[PDB]
Design a protein around this nucleic acid. Structure first.
Ligand SMILES: Nc1nc2c(ncn2[C@H]2CC[C@@H](COP(=O)(O)OP(=O)(O)OP(=O)(O)O)O2)c(=O)[nH]1
Ligand SMILES: [Mg+2]
Ligand SMILES: [Mg+2]
Length: 539
DNA sequence: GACCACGGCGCG
DNA sequence: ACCGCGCCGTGGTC
């Protein structure tokens, strides 16, 4: 039923392509084809063939669009059945699965991929018939967003290589003094990177009490949390905690990053995965630039490596207390809506409490602590873990949790109602109707069920914030194009932009406004904005 | 080499 | 009994 026609495909045909590797910015275009009508076209020269296309329609349209941009073209991404499946069920995350579930087999040949893209789109599209809300999200948010993401990926971000190179040599020396001392206290050397070897040393060789176990294998956990609880039991503990921090940092960022600079761009090119999350957020991959350090002194030295091009400035915008604002609007709780209507900051008020100091003295590292407290309690962390976290009696943590919800009566009300419709309907949804299926809401094992419930009621909050950031990006992007400013990174409720110094100021004001006005809620959405030569100073 | 399950831990 | 991610060594295949 499928015929083979000469390269030149009509228009509106679905593309099919094969890369040497999964990273669009580094891949080699091994093959390019197209499917339309009932015919399939294979281009003898892919790189040559790109120029022919006016749009990228089909499985993973964005990635090919990113490669096209890398080659100087301007092939923008269009329809993509992955986006439709993902909207149908966010568990639809890979072509292999989407293909197996909606009508085909994901292979390694571009003709078959072009053919697959067309039929998949037809099937998935039909099943979105009647889903006005999911269609609204398709055409208004996702499809356009892919274009935004493609440009972000090909643009990349600049990095201070020589800076990280010298940092490595420094931290290496500190790592040395650390392992060296750990070994002395243990009375002998061993692979400190080995959790199993460390386990034996701490729990068998030394007689430190075990605090928790690991999940799948039930071993005695050597986790940071376990170690913090053991800091005073032996002088070796602190040392290990510091060894842990530095090695994590050097092995994950300080060393790998400088080797990831692209030859032709001199910049770092992360990928932005559009269908990799259950709640609707994005994920950053291969270089994951959504998890660059910032919470510790060494972490900050590292963030400092992200810099703007000479003559430019980075501009970072981040929604203030995003999820608490989203929650006030979902639950409709008046005591909470007032909190924002009155300009209050809950992370500040919590951290002020925690550390017995006036708001005025709360620093960033104290606030971050307040966040895991605030977000922890809301999303159901037990008094036991909380007591540990706040370093206070068990009943004091029990009381903290009692007051929190008593303070915002409609939150619990909203939770229970979200959970109930979740059971009946099989899924929960976001403000815009992004849905997530949670079948285990009716598991008969309390353990499994209550865990599904937590996943379930967090989705609407975290998912709504995600929709908001995505819509904001769709609206902001064209405006930035016009101002000659570029959009570099999205970090969940944060955007990192690069703007010519003459225009940094104007860009900062435009972005802030677009972001705060994205979609008016029962509470205003404030955006803290910063500008600097690097990502750290930016915030 | 290339890929994995785990335990861990970076960020949101 | 916080939620959502991806990446890095170990210890182990194949
Ligand atoms: N459950 C949970 N959600 C979190 C946690 N950290 C962040 N989030 C969610 C809620 C906020 C959202 C974005 O994170 P940010 O670091 O931007 O924090 P934020 O809450 O927006 O606040 P802010 O603007 O004051 O920094 O991600 C956490 O530890 N637990
Ligand atoms: Mg924020
Ligand atoms: Mg943020």
């Amino acid at each position: 039923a499928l015929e083979e026609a000469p390269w030149p495909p009509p228009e509106g045909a679905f593309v099919g392509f094969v890369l040497s590797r999964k990273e669009p910015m580094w891949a080699d275009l091994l093959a390019l084809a197209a499917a339309r009508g009932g015919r399939v076209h294979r281009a003898p020269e892919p790189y040559k063939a790109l120029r022919d296309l006016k749009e990228e329609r089909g499985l993973l349209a964005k990635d090919l669009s990113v490669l096209a941009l890398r080659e100087g073209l301007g092939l923008p991404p269009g329809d993509d059945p992955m986006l439709l499946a993902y909207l149908l069920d966010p568990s639809n995350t890979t072509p292999e699965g989407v293909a197996r579930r909606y009508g085909g087999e994901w292979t390694e040949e571009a003709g078959e991929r072009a053919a697959l893209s067309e039929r998949l789109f037809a099937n998935l599209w039909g099943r979105l018939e009647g889903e006005e809300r999911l269609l609204w999200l398709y055409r208004e948010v996702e499809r356009p967003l892919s274009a935004v993401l493609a440009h972000m990926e090909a643009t990349g971000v600049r990095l201070d290589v020589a800076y990280l190179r010298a940092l490595s040599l420094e931290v290496a020396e500190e790592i040395a003094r650390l392992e060296a001392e750990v070994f002395r206290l243990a009375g002998h050397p061993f692979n400190l990177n080995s959790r199993d070897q460390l386990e034996r040393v701490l729990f068998d060789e030394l007689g430190l009490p075990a605090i928790g176990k690991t999940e799948k294998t039930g071993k005695r956990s050597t986790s940071a949390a376990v170690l913090e609880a053991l800091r005073e039991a032996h002088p070796i503990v602190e040392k290990i905690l510091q060894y842990r921090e530095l090695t994590k940092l050097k092995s994950t960022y300080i060393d790998p990053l400088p080797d990831l600079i692209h030859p032709r761009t001199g910049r770092l090119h992360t990928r932005f995965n559009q269908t990799a999350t259950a709640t609707g957020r994005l994920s950053s991959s291969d270089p994951n630039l959504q998890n660059i350090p910032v919470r510790t002194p060494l972490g900050q030295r590292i963030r400092r490596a992200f810099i703007a091009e000479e003559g430019w400035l980075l501009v970072a915008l981040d929604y203030s207390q995003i999820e608490l604002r989203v929650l006030a609007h979902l639950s409709g709780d008046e005591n909470l809506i007032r909190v924002f209507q009155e300009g209050r900051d809950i992370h500040t008020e919590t951290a002020s409490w925690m550390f017995g100091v006036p708001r005025e003295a709360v620093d960033p590292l104290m606030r971050r602590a307040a966040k895991t407290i605030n977000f922890g309690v809301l999303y159901g962390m037990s008094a036991h873990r909380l007591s540990q976290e706040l370093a206070i009696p068990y009943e004091e943590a029990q009381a903290f949790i009692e007051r929190y919800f008593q303070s915002f009566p409609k939150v619990r009300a909203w939770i229970e109602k979200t959970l109930e419709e979740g059971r009946r309907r099989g899924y929960v949804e976001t403000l815009f109707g992004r849905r997530r299926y949670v079948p285990d809401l009716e598991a008969r094992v309390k353990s499994v069920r209550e865990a599904a419930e937590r996943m379930a009621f967090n989705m609407p909050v975290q998912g709504t914030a995600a929709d908001l950031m995505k819509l904001a990006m769709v609206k902001l992007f064209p405006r930035l194009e016009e101002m000659g400013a570029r959009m570099l990174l999205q970090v969940h409720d944060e955007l990192v932009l690069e703007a010519p110094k003459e225009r940094a100021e104007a860009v900062a004001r435009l972005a802030k406004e677009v972001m705060e006005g994205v979609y008016p809620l029962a509470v205003p959405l404030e955006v803290e904005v910063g500008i600097g030569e690097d990502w750290l100073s930016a915030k």
